Design an enzyme around this catalytic site. Structure first.
Site: not given
Ligand SMILES: NC(=O)c1ccc[n+]([C@@H]2O[C@H](COP(=O)([O-])OP(=O)(O)OC[C@H]3O[C@@H](n4cnc5c(N)ncnc54)[C@H](OP(=O)(O)O)[C@@H]3O)[C@@H](O)[C@H]2O)c1
Ligand SMILES: O=C(O)COc1cc(F)ccc1C(=O)NCc1cccc(C(=O)O)c1
Length: 318
Positions: A19-21, A51, A13, A46
């Site tokens: 993708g969107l977190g 969550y 696949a 994602d």
């Molecule tokens: N597998 C795992 O254990 C694990 C662990 C961590 C994360 N994840 C996944 O990865 C995703 C992404 O990681 P993350 O949520 O830790 O953090 P990230 O995507 O590195 O950062 C998210 C932060 O950045 C801000 N942001 C987004 N776009 C921006 C831009 N263009 N300019 C300025 N600030 C911006 C967001 O603010 P706003 O939302 O207020 O716009 C939020 O505060 C998670 O949501 C989850 O789906 C998985």
């Protein structure tokens, strides 16, 4: 921009590379975030049970399917098995709860969220009276066999892992009687945690790597003022300025050019749209090597309450 939108997985696949977190996306904002994302081109979301917002993510997915903005086959929905469900007899029900919340009849990809199993129960981080997280005795290999059953029951199209170190990946690849290889290892990756060793290992085995926290997770709950900040790093801002892009756009394009999938999180409509406009420019090899040079082995997500767990992933170098 010399960049296809999807990467081929070892289950045959294709997976969208952007993708969107949804971690930390508030339940009252994530439905509109996902709706906007799909409207502006995202085809990969994602998710995770831990969550606590999969119901609301699912409302958005279902509405966009009903509106015929997208077809189900065009979406790539990912979720993850939480640590308190590593038991054989709990995996199917955990997957089904996620399916019922997301209002799907299959997941495109289901990941073991962490290699560490915890005692089942209501609490996501069950504690002893002294504050340690209480392990499960179920190991990575038996949990993997339970994941394989989900493929064979039609609940999920692909299975994978998250936060596995190279020896843990190797343990599954070497599992007696292995039926399906992991399709993906989802790991933290950004210019301060560049992950060269683990990425090379996974890619050499045909496992696709997804980079999480690509912006350095500025909204992580444990952020401290003195922590390094990718979005504010003047060296990264300078690369962005040279390319007439935002710093976030550079931080998203970076993993894409390493053959990684990347999952930036936002609930801000303008940023959701901004973050997708990364298929119209190219970082040079010199830019890429310069960004790699910023590595400092800095982790957003260290699972710090679990450092004594037998399967804690981050004692190994990689
Ligand atoms: N597998 C795992 O254990 C694990 C662990 C961590 C994360 N994840 C996944 O990865 C995703 C992404 O990681 P993350 O949520 O830790 O953090 P990230 O995507 O590195 O950062 C998210 C932060 O950045 C801000 N942001 C987004 N776009 C921006 C831009 N263009 N300019 C300025 N600030 C911006 C967001 O603010 P706003 O939302 O207020 O716009 C939020 O505060 C998670 O949501 C989850 O789906 C998985
Ligand atoms: O898995 C991810 O995307 C990001 O990690 C999480 C996400 C959650 F929704 C819920 C907990 C975590 C997580 O690992 N917290 C670690 C933590 C720190 C301090 C006290 C309790 C738990």
């Amino acid at each position: 921009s010399h960049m296809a939108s999807r990467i081929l997985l070892n289950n045959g696949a294709k997976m969208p590379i952007l993708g969107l977190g949804t971690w930390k996306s508030p339940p009252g904002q994530v439905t509109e975030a996902v709706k906007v994302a799909i409207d502006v081109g995202y085809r990969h979301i994602d998710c995770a049970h831990v969550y606590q917002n999969e119901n609301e993510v699912g409302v958005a997915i279902q509405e966009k399917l009903r509106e015929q903005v997208v077809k189900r086959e065009e979406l790539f929905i990912v979720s993850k098995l939480w640590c308190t469900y590593h038991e054989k007899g709990l995996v199917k029900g955990a997957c089904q709860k996620t399916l019922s919340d997301l209002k799907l009849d299959y997941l495109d990809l289901y990941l073991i969220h962490w290699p560490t199993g915890f005692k089942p129960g209501k609490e996501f981080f069950p504690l002893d009276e002294s504050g340690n997280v209480v392990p499960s005795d179920t190991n990575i290999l038996d949990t993997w066999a339970a994941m394989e059953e989900l493929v064979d029951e039609g609940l999920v199209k692909a299975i994978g892992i998250s936060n596995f170190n190279h020896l843990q990946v190797e343990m599954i690849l070497n599992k007696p009687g292995l039926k399906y290889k992991p399709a993906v290892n989802q790991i933290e990756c950004h210019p301060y945690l560049t992950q060269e060793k683990l990425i090379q290992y996974c890619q050499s085995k045909g496992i696709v790597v997804t980079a999480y926290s690509p912006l350095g997770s500025p909204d992580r709950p444990w952020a401290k003022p003195e922590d390094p900040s990718l979005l504010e790093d003047p060296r990264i801002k300078a690369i962005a300025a040279k390319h007439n892009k935002t710093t976030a756009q550079v931080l998203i394009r970076f993993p894409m050019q390493r053959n990684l999938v990347v999952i930036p999180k936002s609930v801000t409509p303008e940023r959701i749209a901004e973050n997708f406009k990364v298929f119209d420019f190219e970082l040079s090899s010199q830019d890429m090597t310069t960004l790699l040079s910023y590595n400092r082995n800095w982790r957003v997500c260290g699972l710090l309450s679990c450092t004594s767990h037998k399967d804690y992933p981050f004692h190994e170098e990689f």
